[PDB]
Design a protein around this ligand. Structure first.
Ligand SMILES: CSc1ccccc1CC(=O)N1C[C@H](C)C[C@H](C(N)=O)C1
Ligand SMILES: [Zn+2]
Length: 140
């Protein structure tokens, strides 16, 4: 679990969104595993606006933050899970690292701010849903 809190927005994995998230929906995209809802209080996270390929992510199954090198956002085939069938997920970046299903939502960040959140995992791979292209998170 985990979310990004920027301005009056809450960014979560679409597959982990709550009823309150759907009832206060701003935007959602199943192909990216992302959902954004509105919040009453202002958040403290800042979104990175960069092309960094190195950063640090939080892994809840190890209570640890790990430095990683990650690929550029791309269209990647992801295997079937309890939340989606096997399909292509867009705007996904891969890295070598530990992940388990419950690690979804952990933040990946670089020197500029939040880059994205954990969305997929494999035997020693972790995938992150990028948010750096969502410029509207910084306004309104
Ligand atoms: C950190 S996720 C993980 C880690 C290790 C092993 C397996 C996983 C699970 C995983 O890759 N998916 C299942 C998740 C319910 C939906 C994901 C998606 N965004 O399509 C894909
Ligand atoms: Zn950066």
């Amino acid at each position: 679990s985990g979310a990004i809190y920027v301005g009056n927005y809450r960014v979560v994995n679409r597959h982990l969104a709550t009823h309150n998230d759907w009832a206060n929906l701003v935007w959602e995209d199943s192909s990216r595993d992302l959902l954004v809802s509105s919040t009453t209080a202002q958040g403290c996270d800042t979104i990175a606006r960069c092309d960094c390929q190195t950063g640090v992510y939080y892994c809840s199954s190890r209570r640890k933050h790990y430095p990683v090198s990650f690929s550029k956002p791309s269209l990647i085939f992801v295997e079937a899970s309890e939340y989606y069938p096997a399909r292509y997920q867009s705007h996904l970046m891969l890295a070598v690292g530990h992940s388990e299903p419950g690690d979804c939502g952990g933040i990946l960040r670089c020197q500029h701010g939040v880059v994205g959140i954990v969305s997929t995992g494999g035997n020693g791979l972790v995938g992150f849903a990028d948010v750096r292209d969502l410029l509207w998170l910084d306004e309104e």
